[PDB]
Design a protein around this nucleic acid. Structure first.
Ligand SMILES: [Mg+2]
Ligand SMILES: [Mg+2]
Ligand SMILES: [Zn+2]
Ligand SMILES: [Zn+2]
Lengths: 589, 589
DNA sequence: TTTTTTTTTTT
């Protein structure tokens, strides 16, 4: 019963963070500048400042938020009167709730309480409008009266029409007036539990969440998010009894977090090391012995090149890697590691995927009867990495559907009266086996690969892996047994901070090509083309695409060290890595 | 007539266990400490204590269970007052009901009586909420009153709305109030009769069961369960009568069990025998003469290895066995025995299965038109054993769908806008015939097996069975006729005990590799690679997977004797069994 | 009819 608005104001105005700069007065300072009508407050901060205040938000969230939000609005008005007539209400979002519940463990006792759920966003609906205060006209020749139907109460989830006119007391028919109705933004989304918490032999479960007002379009499908809000039962057709007094539960989101300053200096400290590139390479798949050249190639694909957008066309900035090897060469283990360290990645297999599922699917809604597009794997991976294991097992008629997405980075659909074009700017990493399971050194490269030259030319680097039992078996066996014994390699960058390093580099680094790097790349390309003409029967063709691979690889090397330009050292590395690629496919220089 | 609450309370406090330890008193505090809010009792113990109490439960179940619930709740509160305000209702479940009825023999006379049914779970729905006490607000300009609609009575299965407002006596509009409504967890499951109970030439029958409150998520599909509760008729769509006074039936589950301390003593006593490993092997398929190396191999697959989960990757712990042999070599008979003895096994046929059915299928839901996922055979066998008979009869383009699930133990689907990953951690045992039906000694091994090297490397052990007539025919003929004569081999562990032994071993034993075992395994693997390179023509490749096979087999041998360490003795056995596998495929050592 | 994944018969 004690007043908390005064406690809120002093907490907001007076608070000391770890940085010791009064974090919480800068957020409200930016609140009036950009007019976002939403404030983020950490539960750890309010708990430290006032234990009693933190509890009251947890257990009395229903009747403490409108009071608390009203106090904040008055303080905002005092700071700047211009906020009036621009924003009517300001929302306060609380994050970091200790009450975290697994999606499968939700029971009846959790209804009506503020909880937090971690999951994967799979579906988003277009933004719509919801009525919370309607206006009606009594169509009865004596009334012609206007009244807001739900008095001193917002309109419930199910729309209800008045039966007795409050202005005359007589029944009849009522007409809604849209221009006098108050609306609010409304969006529906579906949250799926993470594969980590799925029990054995069970399919994952899904939960429906509702986003309103400024929370709409705050995330995209495939993201990993944490949602805080209140659970409630869902009503769809209350008019039809139809027995079965059983309801499903939904969630009203109060705040959403999508998966800080101390990370910047931590990343900058790593880049200061002159051997940062070697540290990153050594940190790729620490459980795999050897394969140093493959680890270097996979590191480049994670960073990628610099895309170019021009007046008339655009140039692909992503790097594609293809690996062919004998079974048991740990090709899949490295691909699994890539899908974990990448900030955004989609893992698919050759046999378990279709052309429609990879790019886009045209699906007909049974109710409406209209066709609409469904995002494929490549579309969902835009701006990230796409992994296609067992690519050689895909049907050739089905594999050609990704030819344009791999180079033009677009998906074109002309089906069922729908013509559309979707961006698919995603790097592709693929693995497969030779034609006869294992590579045969007694036969040419032409029949060993068994892939059309069109798709091969789209890959920047192609590595052929040969399992040759030699003198390294003892070293390999010792390394494997140490892994099984729990021994772990040291002096490596862990997966969590490595993911942050890649995300920062891909966002704030854009290397430029210098004059000295141009000469080295130009000379190598001329020699590469001349050497290729010696053998025309090989299925590997040196096209102008290979020249752009040199540029992309060179930029990726500079981006690893957070450099602002491509020097001659990066060009030398780019030439060296492709020399190994050419040697593997049988081209010697 | 008389009150049994005093008898019930003293029954728990005065009952004596097997060794006079009062096996009910220590359950009460466990319920209090863990707040499990559910207590189970045994009918035979109740019958052994007081015959009158047992009859009243078995007959007047609908009027004595709430009475015993109240007495139990009072006894908990006095034992620990803190139990209040956390659990407002405690359920008591009775098991071991003598009234057992087959699913196909249910008649109208059994309706409303406490009965027990044994069957197989097939379908489970997501957990929902059911209203048992609602709150309404009369939307009439004069009432604005809130009341609980069902007075002194639970809300029936049909959602019924008040017609006359009790607070004012007038009809009108009533609005449900979810905040004041009381809910209860609700789940729906389908149970199927056992295959051995189905009459000749008919499909198995199914029954619908309802699980509520703590009984939700009590089992997974494919389990064998025993459900006890009251039968009742199902009212689904009573809005329109449409004649047809015929109704279905459903069961309200009161207690459920799936598929003990006495068994642990028996299991531990068996492991004390030094020759337990040989005793266990002799118990595998007692009706099959010979094939000692195959029985030993099948025993290892039942126990398996130790899966390793690291911060960046995970290692398969299951063991895969492949058998190729001439027809009539009892391959199918031995595989059928494995399905019976394994705690969780799925039997499939190569011809009677498809790629979608083995791993996962995307099906368009008819009600909404939206695609969703259906678990395949491998997913349903997670944590168990998958048996694939006639693997050679599968289409090659269709058999490759299980390559990922057999090594990475995952299933990836990218179809119709659905991207998902599922765990398929199961062991695969497969059997098949050579290319020409029977093994041809003239031709090499490569054309006899007729399988790609990729799938062959996935199998830890491969055995080739040759039906060669010889001097052993008389011994085989005598053994078969003795089986047909009813004679049974003695000194073998029964199938029921063996299943319990395997389940205990797989849950509480995690062997570790010692230094001595590491040296023996490393030396053998190096020798294997050197020998394989000398003859680069065999269809078997010694990949690094073979090294991990030795580790998994070594752990399985230690796990068979409930040993916590892998001594040198287990390494020698693992090396010895692998030697026989190599000699079978013609790889001399 | 139409696109899609699936089991099935039959164009
Ligand atoms: Mg692989
Ligand atoms: Mg057979
Ligand atoms: Zn009126
Ligand atoms: Zn009333």
């Amino acid at each position: 019963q004690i007043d908390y608005r005064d406690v809120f104001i002093e907490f907001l105005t007076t608070f000391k963070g770890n940085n010791n700069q009064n974090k919480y007065i800068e957020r409200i300072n930016e609140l009036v500048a950009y007019r976002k009508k939403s404030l983020i407050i950490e539960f750890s901060d309010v708990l430290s400042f006032n234990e009693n205040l933190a509890y009251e938000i947890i257990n009395n969230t229903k009747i403490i938020l409108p009071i608390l939000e009203g106090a904040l609005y008055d303080h905002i008005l005092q700071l700047d009167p211009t906020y009036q007539r621009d924003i009517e209400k300001v929302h306060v979002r609380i994050v970091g709730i200790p009450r975290v519940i697994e999606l499968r463990k939700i029971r009846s006792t959790d209804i009506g309480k503020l909880i937090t759920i971690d999951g994967i966003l799979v579906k988003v609906t277009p933004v719509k409008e919801r009525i919370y205060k309607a206006t009606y006209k009594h169509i009865h020749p004596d009334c012609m009266q206007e009244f807001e139907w739900p008095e001193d109460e917002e309109m419930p989830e199910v729309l209800e029409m008045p039966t007795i006119c409050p202005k005359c007391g007589k029944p009849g028919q009522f007409r809604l007036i849209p221009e006098k109705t108050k609306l609010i933004d409304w969006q529906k989304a579906v949250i799926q539990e993470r594969p980590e918490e799925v029990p054995s032999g069970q399919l994952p479960r899904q939960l429906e969440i509702i986003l309103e007002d400024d929370l709409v379009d705050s995330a995209r499908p495939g993201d990993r998010v944490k949602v805080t809000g209140i659970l409630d039962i869902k009503q769809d057709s209350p008019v039809k009894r139809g027995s079965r007094a059983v309801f499903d539960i939904y969630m009203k989101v109060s705040s959403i977090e999508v998966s800080s300053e101390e990370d910047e200096k931590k990343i900058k400290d790593l880049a200061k090391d002159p051997w940062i590139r070697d540290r990153i390479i050594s940190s790729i798949a620490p459980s795999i012995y050897g394969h140093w050249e493959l680890k270097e190639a996979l590191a480049l694909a994670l960073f990628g090149g610099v895309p170019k957008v021009l007046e008339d066309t655009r140039i692909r900035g992503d790097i594609h890697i293809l690996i062919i090897g004998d079974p048991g060469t740990a090709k899949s283990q490295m691909l699994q590691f890539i899908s974990r360290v990448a900030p955004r990645a989609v893992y698919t297999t050759g046999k378990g995927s279709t052309a429609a599922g990879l790019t886009a699917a045209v699906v007909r809604e049974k109710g409406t009867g209209e066709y609409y597009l469904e995002a494929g794997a490549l579309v969902l991976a835009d701006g990230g990495i796409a992994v296609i294991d067992e690519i050689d097992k895909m049907r050739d008629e089905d594999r050609v559907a990704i030819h344009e997405a791999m180079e033009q980075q677009t998906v074109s659909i002309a089906k069922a009266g729908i013509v559309a074009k979707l961006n698919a700017r995603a790097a592709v990493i693929a693995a497969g086996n030779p034609k006869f399971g294992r590579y045969i050194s007694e036969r040419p490269v032409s029949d060993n690969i068994n892939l059309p030259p069109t798709i091969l030319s789209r890959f920047d680097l192609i590595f052929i892996l040969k399992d040759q039992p030699g003198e390294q078996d003892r070293e390999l066996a010792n390394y494997i047994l140490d892994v099984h014994s729990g021994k772990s390699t040291k002096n490596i960058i862990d997966i969590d901070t490595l993911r942050k390093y890649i995300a920062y580099a891909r966002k704030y680094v854009t290397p430029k090509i210098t004059s000295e790097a141009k000469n080295l790349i130009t000379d190598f390309f001329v020699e590469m083309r001349k050497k290729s003409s010696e053998t025309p029967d090989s299925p590997i063709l040196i096209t102008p695409r290979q020249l752009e691979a040199l540029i992309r690889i060179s930029e990726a090397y500079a981006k690893m060290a957070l450099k602002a330009e491509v020097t001659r050292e990066d060009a030398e590395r780019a030439i060296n890595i492709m020399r190994l690629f050419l040697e593997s496919v049988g081209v010697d220089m």
